[PDB]
Amino acid sequence: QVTLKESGGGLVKPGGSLRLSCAASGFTFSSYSMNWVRQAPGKGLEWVSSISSSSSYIYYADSVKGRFTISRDNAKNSLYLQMNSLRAEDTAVYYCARQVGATWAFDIWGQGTLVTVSSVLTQPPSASGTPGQRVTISCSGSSSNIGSNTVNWYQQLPGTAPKLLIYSNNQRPSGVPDRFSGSKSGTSASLAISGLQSEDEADYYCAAWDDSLNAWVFGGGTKLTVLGAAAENLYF
Amino acid sequence: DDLYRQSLEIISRYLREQATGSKDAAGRRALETLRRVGDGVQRNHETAFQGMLRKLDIKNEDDVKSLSRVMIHVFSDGVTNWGRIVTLISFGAFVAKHLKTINQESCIEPLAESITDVLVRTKRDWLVKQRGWDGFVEFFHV
């Protein structure tokens, strides 16, 4: 079983410190780049930090620079996040995610850990449809992100961790139905669901690497509602 | 330049062992990958590499020096990827093998310097964005 499991979350006071751990199983950890992605309650995904296989290349989001330190111990299959000078703005579920070497997609995600301290790509906030209908979700970027690099799409069902839906603009991983499709044109990208199903009611996020920011940029997310959907698509 | 030094160490140590025929932290993992991917490219492109070596006509020290100068314009079509980089290094290993058979083993180090010079000079920005040698390892992981 290929898995990631985050640890170390909890309640901390502003100005405090907390260390997160991420335990990797079922794969050769030392051959993959790893990332931390967080999500404030009721809000979108925000990339935090990334570290290459041998720790030679490290990157941070502007909002955590100087306060957060990412590290890894390949001998323990572990990824760490040292968080100092914690602010209320850092409250979020923190996810550990594995990056594919050939595509840079985040193919494996942990369940997340809650830290309680007490958008460069754009997407419509909502989208809706009846079952069987075709819906489209756009993702707007610019020269240094979508215009220079590939786009990835993630799907997050309510109460679940995000899952890889599309990679390299239009490629589907195993386990993703052919009803989902993606496209990239200029600095824009789009996700199409051809024949809405009950299970498609989820939040959808686009993401791309930004050459100017040297950061991963996530879209604000689109909440997809399936009006009049039946449990497991069985209409009685 | 930590990237040129690291790349030179990786490419030279790989070309020197390919000629000799015997195997000698981030650089350690990159070398293991280059040994697997590189030997594979040389095995599957042996006929194409034989034609390229015959065309270049390498018989002495000066022929390696001329190859060194023509090297800066190898990626003139604007196509950049890890496949193209490993193809240059693998062809360099193939020319390093030939150099050992023509009793010109001293030519392996300037050949390694020229391959490294072109990669770091014309592709530095690309290599840096690709996480350099960590990126190389992660790209070819199976």
Residue numbers in the entry:
A (entry chain B): 1 to 118, 137 to 254
B (entry chain A): 172 to 195, 204 to 321
What does the paper say about this structure?
Surprisingly, a second apo structure determined at 1.96 Å resolution from the same materials showed an intriguing feature. The TEV cleavage-site remnant G246AAAENLYF254 from a symmetry-related molecule had bound in the Mcl-1 BH3 binding site. The amino acids were clearly ordered, allowing unequivocal fitting of the sequence. Although an artefact of the crystallization, this observation suggests how malleable the BH3 binding site is. In accommodating the short length of polypeptide, Leu252, Tyr253 and Phe254 displace and partially melt helix 4 (Ser245–Ser255). The effect is to widen the pocket by displacing Ile251, His252 and Val253 outwards by around 3 Å and allowing the position of the Met250 Cα atom to move by around 3.6 Å. However, the position of the Sδ atom is unchanged, which appears to keep the hydrophobic packing in this region intact, accommodating Leu252 and Phe254. The C-terminal tag remnant G246AAAENLYF254 was observed to interact with the BH3 binding site in the Mcl-1–scFv complex. Although it had been demonstrated that it was possible to generate ligand-bound structures using the scFv, even by soaking, the presence of the TEV cleavage remnant was a concern for the project.
